[PDB]
Each structure stands twice: as C-alpha cells, then as structure tokens.
Design a protein around this nucleic acid. Structure first.
Lengths: 153, 54, 67, 164, 97, 48, 24, 127
RNA sequence: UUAAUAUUUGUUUAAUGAAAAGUAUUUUAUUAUUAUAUUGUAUAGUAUUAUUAUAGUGUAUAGUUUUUUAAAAAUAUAAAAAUA
C-alpha cells in the first residue's frame, strides 16, 4: 500500500515516464521500505502527565502539595513512550483504557508475526493476550532431562 | 586483421553506432552462460572453504 | 533618508547606517547599496552644478511625502 | 470456484517488482532518500555496541563528547589529493585538489592553513564530480568513490620541478 | 609555501628513484602505551602520509599507460591499518571513560 | 560515448584527457555572451 | 478569459533579517 | 506549516539565493528541508530529479545534467542576510583542524614503524 | 525456397527563393574573472515548441530529414504545352 502510494506520488511529481535513467532508477528505488514505528494515538483531550497534581491536598503554610503515601501507592500507572510511565488517580484511569490496549499490543503489525498463530507449536508456546505475541516460558532440554531423571521416569 | 577486414568490405556499407551505443552500457547485467562457466572452471578457489584443513 | 537608506535597522541591536564591513579589501568602510551609490551620484551632480554656478537641480529636492 | 484444490501458499505477485538496489553506475546516479531499518540498526551498533552495552544517556548522546563527534574533532579524517599535472614542472597560480564532498571552501582553507601551513589562499573554486567508473577484465562495473574538485588560487605561482 | 606542495607530492618519484616499502605499521599494543596527544600527533602524521600516497596513486591512475602500476602499494594498506588501530584504542579509552 | 572511445586511455594508446591538440575542437565557433552571475549581482546590488 | 489581466518584497517570511516597521 | 525556514522554502534574496536542500549538523540548532519521511520523500526527490523553477526564469537547484547528492552536503553554517553575502549564526559547525604541539618524541617519530633504485615501469607491484 | 529479387543506393556538393532561441536528455574537460557557506558546469549532437515565462542598431561559410550513376519498358510529374 505504502509502496504503491509512494510510486504514484513520485510518478505524479518527478517521473516523466520515459526511458530516462532517472525514471529507470526511480522504478527500482521506490521499492525500498521505510522505517515502521508504532505511534500511539496522543490524547489532547486529557493529558495524563497533567493529572499528577490532581486529587491532592496542599499545605497552607508553604502552598504546595502534600506527598500522600496512600495516593502514591494507589496511583495507577499509564504507559507512554516519551513519558514512560505516569501516575494518575484511579478515578480517572477509565478514560485511558485505549492507551492500555495499545501498549499491551506488540508494537508491530499483526500480519508480520502472524506466522506464529498459523502453527500448533507456536500456538502452544506463545501468548495471545491483547494481541501481545510474547513467548511464554520454555524449559531447556537439559532442564527437562534433569527434571525427568529426578522424577525417575 | 582489423584494417584488412575493413579494407576488404565495400565503402557503401555503413554502420551507425561506431561512437555511441543505443542502450546505456553502465547497467550491471549478467554475463553469458559459456563465459560464466569458464570463470567457474578457472577460479575454483573463490568458493568458501576451498583450502584444505588442516 | 537623504543618503538613500530604506530600513533603519539592519539588526535589532545596531542601526543599518553604522554597518561597516570587515573581512575585505576596505576595512572600516561603510557598506553602500546601488541605491546609496545612485543617491550619492545625484548629490555629487548637484554639488558640481552649484560649484559651476548654474541652477543646482537636486532631483530629490522636489520629493515630498506623497512623492 | 474450486478453492479446495490448492494448498495454502501465497503465490508470487505478477508482475514481480525489481530489487530496491540501484544498479545504475552512470552520470545520473540517484541517492535513495528512503531510510531502511538496517541503516538505523548499523548506526546504533557502531555508535554504542548495540545491544550488548547499555545505551549512553541522552546528554552524552547529544553532547560534543559522544564518541563519533569526539573522534571526528580530535582525529579528523579528510582525504586531500593534489593533482600532479596541475603543478608538476609548470609555474601555476591555480593548483587543484580533490576533497570529500562534505567539505567546503572554508573547510579546505582552514585545512591548508592549519595542517600544511598554506595560509595565502585567495579563492577556492568548488565543483562536484561523480566518481570514476570503469570495467575490469570480467566486465564488472566498479565505480570509484566520489570526489569534489577544488581550484585554489594563490598570490604567488608555485611549481614542483621534476628532476629529469 | 612550496615545501607544502613538495611534501604533498612524493620525493623518490620526484627524483625518479624507486620508492622502498617501509618496515611495518603501528600496532594496537604500541598505541595502548602511547598517550592521547601522542596518538593524535601520529594520527596527523599518518594523515599527511596517506594524503601523499593517495596523490601518487591518483597520478599513476591518470598515467597508467605512461607509467606502470604504482610502486610499493602496500604503504596505503599499512597506513589504513595504523589509522584503524588508533581508532580502536581511542574507542576503548572512550568506552572506559 | 565518443569521449571514452577516443580521448580516454586504452591498451593501445596513451590518455588524451589533458591534450590540447585533441581538446581544442571542443570550443564553440561562434562566441557567446557570458552567463548572468547571481553572486556577482548580489555583491553589486547589496540589498538594504 | 480572453481579456488580459493587465510582488513580495520580503519572501523570507513574517520576520527575517532586518526588522520591518516599528515594534509593538 | 513546515519546519524548515521560509527562506529555505523561497530564498529571501531577489535572485532566490539560499534555496534548495541544506543538510544540518545533528548538534546544530538550525533545521533543514532534508527529511527522509515517507511523506517528505516526494518533494525531496523532485528537488533532485527536476529542480525548482523560479519566477525570474532561472532554475536554481539541479540546473541540469548531473543530479546532486543531498546526503553529502556540508552542514549548514548560517542564514543568508540581504546586507552581506552570507550571515554565519553557528560557528561550531565549521570544523577547525588543529595541529598538536611538538615534543621530544613527536619530532623523533615517523609514520611507519621500523620492523626488527632507478625507477622501472612495471605492470604490477605486489608490495 | 521466395532471392541474379522488391524498397533503398548519401564521404562537399547544382549550397540552399535562406539564416537572430528556449526547453529535456547523452557526454564530459586543469576555462578565465568578479575575487566571503551549499547546490547544479562548456561545446557537440538528439526530441519538442498552438493553448502568452523566446523578436532586437540590423541574423554563424547555415549544405543528412538535401540521397549515386554512359539504356529501353513500367511508374511519377498536366506547374510536363509549342495539344485536344
């Protein structure tokens, strides 16, 4: 899709569609693939790093917030790339439910690792939770041999 | 024998690409089968792990 | 204005008239545009006319705010 | 349609597309703007030994002390080649040099002033030039690295005599 | 002045004499014992040597029919190896730092 | 490719790349006016 | 149209190089 | 709106001086119109294949014949001012080569290490 | 096989009822000069010019889209009439 889009764009922009070496080289250079990085959809309606100072009392003397250990403990952690983890009161964690799914999902198109679910071995050895294709635990051959030999069977 | 070969031909015969070629000759393209086989038969030590060990 | 400058400030920290260019053949010499050189042509012409004694016709003496 | 007759293998697309490797080595060779993942991987690996060593912090990465910039500043690498024909057995006032493309007139004049001591430099005439291309005996097209031609002008004509 | 161009060009080729191949190149064992300022000094020395060698190589490529292959070509390889060893030592020191 | 055919070096002839007797015919017969210099026009106008 | 129809002094943008007009 | 300066877009000078692709140093604060984005590749490829056509009637970038290489441009050093020919705003970009001081061992060293005549035209020299 | 064929036949010539350019390629070379970053170079060919970015103190020895020769027939030329 992206390759065809770039090809059409270059053909409309700078390709004369002649036998020139310019177009002859473009027809082969446009097949190259660009960088792919899963960009999580930003939330301008609700800034998660803004709610750090929310739901907190303040000392009237110094006019600054009170470091409540109960709030620090019960704080829910929302993930984001530039702001790795952010604490937020649990009352407002509902609006950030989609960021949770986008973070739990593997930051890669599903059809690139779809070769996992298409076989029984990987279907049994891998995890499929919120589209997170992370490999489960697997004992080594030495480990399973030692376990069986200790179990005497 | 190039001078002799050119002298034996008739002056009316003409060839139009003496100083320039039609297709660009700077695109890397493959050789012919017989000469590739000649290369593979002459240079065998280019293959990986050709040297005897030890 | 009578020299021929249009922008008073070349930079926000210095005037445009006090710009003398270094790193060149003429050091400390004030920079002049083609408009500045042509206005100086007009001034020198008027001065030479006045020295000759004929009517000094400074072309920019009849220049008002509306032109 | 009889879909049960086939097995589950994706057929090749028709017409098949060409590899993204540019095969033209002529005068109009184009630099591909598309960035590949392998390029970033190799850059990071040569920078800080990815993924064995931990990454340096952002401060050191973006600072002047980062290893590539530090090495480029304390051990500069610039290939300056003098043309023998331009100054050999002839009193010439415009000697020419070959430099990398990443240099400029000021870069070259500072180079000649600090390293070789050639301070009297009037003007440097810059002109890029595609690398030399040639074929070997088997017909493989091998192109030499690109080089920028510079024509430096001096106040006094210079010459290096060749004792015949 | 003129000595700069005389050192840009070769000397044995200038006197029409066969240039001899030097002994060896800088080893990492030696460059570890060498100091940082000493390392950059010998780096600039090798840079000037490589510039002269590349000028001679380009001259021979320009005249490959008038003059045969460049005499003593392993000098460029020795210089490149010395530069690579310098870079290796500097990279190790920077990694420790 | 006439330059590479004739002027270039070959196993039968020496390089004619820098040879006046072989390059002098490349110059035009009818002289032409010089091209406009934008850098010269800038250094001459000196916008204010 | 068959009839004939019968200009940017500072293309540097909004503010570039020399300041334009009085401030504020 | 774009990130690169509007003079880079359309040169502030009358003759379109300072237009085209200008690569910037990573540590430099100035930005350039050289971007490898999948959305910025069409214009940056047109700048190399066709070029920019000015109102005055002259083609500024890639006048013709040989296409430039935008990746090997020396890093940007400043911005064009109408008064002078060029205004330098970043001096750290311009590399300044410097020679080390001489020393008792420095003037005694040589390029090659010492390991423990008439020129004859030869077709091949091994070492 | 068609084929001892069909169509072609070109090295300054009978030089032309004529002559001021732009644009995109191919090919590149130590140009000079004004003498402050980068960037693309010159001639020579090739393809194109409606749909205004080519017209003036006055126009390149310009001849490849211009082509050889000691016959009749066929064919073309009615600008090949001194016919009808």
């Amino acid at each position: 899709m992206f390759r065809v889009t770039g090809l059409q764009l270059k053909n409309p922009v700078v390709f004369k569609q002649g036998q020139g070496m310019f177009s002859h080289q473009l027809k082969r250079l446009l097949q190259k693939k660009s960088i792919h990085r899963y960009n999580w959809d930003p939330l301008p309606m609700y800034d998660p790093r803004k709610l750090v100072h929310a739901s907190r009392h303040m000392d009237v003397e110094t006019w600054r917030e009170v470091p409540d250990p109960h709030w620090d403990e019960r704080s829910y952690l929302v993930p984001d790339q530039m702001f790795y983890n952010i604490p937020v009161p649990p009352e407002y964690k509902d609006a950030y439910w989609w960021r949770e799914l986008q973070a739990r999902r593997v930051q890669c198109p599903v059809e690139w690792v779809s070769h996992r679910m298409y076989n029984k071995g990987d279907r049994q050895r891998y995890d499929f939770q919120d589209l997170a294709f992370r490999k489960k635990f697997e004992f080594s051959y030495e480990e399973v041999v030692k376990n069986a030999k200790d179990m005497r069977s | 024998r190039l001078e002799l070969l050119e002298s034996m031909r008739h002056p009316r015969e003409r060839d139009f690409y003496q100083d320039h070629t039609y297709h660009n000759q700077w695109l890397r393209r493959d050789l012919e089968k017989h000469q590739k086989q000649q290369l593979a038969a002459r240079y065998k030590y280019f293959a990986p792990d050709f040297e005897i060990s030890p | 204005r009578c020299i021929g400058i249009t922008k008073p400030f070349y930079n926000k920290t210095t005037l445009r008239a006090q710009c003398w260019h270094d790193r060149g053949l003429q050091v400390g010499t004030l920079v002049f545009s083609q408009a500045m050189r042509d206005a100086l042509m007009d001034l020198e012409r008027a001065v030479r006319r006045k020295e000759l004694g004929l009517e000094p016709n400074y072309v920019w003496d009849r220049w008002g705010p509306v032109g | 349609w009889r879909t049960w007759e086939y097995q589950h293998t994706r057929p090749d697309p028709r017409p098949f597309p060409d590899p993204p490797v540019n095969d033209y080595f002529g005068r109009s060779r184009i630099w591909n703007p598309i960035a590949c993942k392998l390029g970033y991987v190799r850059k990071k690996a040569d920078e800080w030994g990815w993924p064995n060593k931990p990454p340096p912090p952002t401060g050191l990465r973006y600072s002047q002390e980062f290893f590539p910039f530090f090495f480029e500043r304390y051990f500069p690498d610039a290939e300056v080649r003098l043309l023998l024909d331009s100054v050999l057995n002839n009193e010439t006032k415009r000697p020419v040099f070959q430099i990398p493309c990443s240099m400029s007139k000021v870069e070259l004049v500072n180079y000649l002033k600090n390293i070789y001591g050639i301070d009297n430099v009037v003007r440097v005439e810059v002109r890029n030039r595609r690398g030399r291309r040639y074929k070997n005996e088997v017909g493989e097209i091998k192109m030499m690295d690109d080089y920028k031609v510079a024509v430096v002008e001096l106040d006094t004509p210079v010459s290096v005599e060749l004792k015949q | 002045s003129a000595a700069a161009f005389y050192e840009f060009v070769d000397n044995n080729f200038l006197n029409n004499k066969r240039p001899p191949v030097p002994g060896g190149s800088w080893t990492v064992e030696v460059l570890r014992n060498k100091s940082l300022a000493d390392l950059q000094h010998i780096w600039f020395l090798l840079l000037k040597e490589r510039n002269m060698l590349k000028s001679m190589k380009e001259h021979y490529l320009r005249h490959q029919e008038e003059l045969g292959a460049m005499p003593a070509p392993s000098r460029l390889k020795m210089i490149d190896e010395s530069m690579r060893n310098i870079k290796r030592v500097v990279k190790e020191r920077d990694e420790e730092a | 490719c006439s330059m590479r055919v004739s002027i270039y070096s070959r196993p039968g002839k020496v390089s004619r790349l820098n040879n006046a007797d072989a390059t002098w015919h490349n110059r035009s017969r009818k002289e032409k006016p010089p091209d406009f210099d934008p850098s010269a026009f800038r250094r001459r106008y000196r916008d204010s | 149209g068959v009839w004939n129809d019968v200009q940017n002094p500072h293309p540097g943008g909004d503010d570039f190089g020399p300041p334009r007009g009085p401030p504020k | 709106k774009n990130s690169w300066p509007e003079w880079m877009d359309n040169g502030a000078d009358g003759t379109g001086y300072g237009i085209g692709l200008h690569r910037t140093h990573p540590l430099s604060r100035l930005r350039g119109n050289l971007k490898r984005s999948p959305s910025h590749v069409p214009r940056v490829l047109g700048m190399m294949i066709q070029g920019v056509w000015h109102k005055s009637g002259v083609k500024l970038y890639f006048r013709g014949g040989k296409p430039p290489n935008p990746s090997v441009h020396p890093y940007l050093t400043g911005e064009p001012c109408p008064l002078y020919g060029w205004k330098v705003t970043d001096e750290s970009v311009i590399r300044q080569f410097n020679m080390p001081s001489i020393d008792g061992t420095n003037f005694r060293y040589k390029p090659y290490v010492a390991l423990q005549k008439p020129l004859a035209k030869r077709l091949f020299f091994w070492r």
